[PDB]
Amino acid sequence: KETAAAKFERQHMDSSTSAASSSNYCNQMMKSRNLTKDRCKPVNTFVHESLADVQAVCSQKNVACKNGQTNCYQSYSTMSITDCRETGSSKYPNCAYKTTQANKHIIVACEGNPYVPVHFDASV
């Protein structure tokens, strides 16, 4: 099955754009990346940077994850990200999202060898 590493790329990476370009970005991307297949995923963040720069976070600032795990890492630099939150009109399978653009530090959990991001923990 899909590796934790590949799932992170599919759920969270968008190197093809610098930023969300219209209010429909989240609707289009949640759909196209297959995140609304079984249910409307309530929240999701997309990162508009090269994969190499996001992978490098695993060698940056070690921090505890929101759940208390100690394999979390925070980016030294801010990154271009898009936050997607379900709207009050969202109704499976017509999942609907509010697109919000932001520039923040990202916190990821890392695992494996190579040591790469497997979970997006938060943006700060």
UniProtKB/Swiss-Prot annotation:
Enzyme class: lyase
Family as reported in the entry's similarity comment: Belongs to the pancreatic ribonuclease family.
Annotated GO CC locations: extracellular region
Coverage span on the entire protein: 27 to 150 of 150
Stated name of the protein: Ribonuclease pancreatic
Keywords on record: Disulfide bond, Endonuclease, Glycation, Glycoprotein, Hydrolase, Lyase, Nuclease, Secreted, Signal
Molecular functions per Gene Ontology: lyase activity; nucleic acid binding; ribonuclease A activity; RNA nuclease activity
Binding residues for substrate: 7, 10, 41-45, 66, 85
UniProt function note: Endonuclease that catalyzes the cleavage of RNA on the 3' side of pyrimidine nucleotides. Acts on single-stranded and double-stranded RNA.
Phylogenetic placement of the source organism: Eukaryota, Metazoa, Chordata, Craniata, Vertebrata
Subcellular location: Secreted
Keyword Signal carried by entry: yes
Disulfide bonds: 26-84, 40-95, 58-110, 65-72
Record EC number: 4.6.1.18
Residue positions of the active site: 12, 119
SUBUNIT field: Interacts with and forms tight 1:1 complexes with RNH1. Dimerization of two such complexes may occur. Interaction with RNH1 inhibits this protein. Monomer.
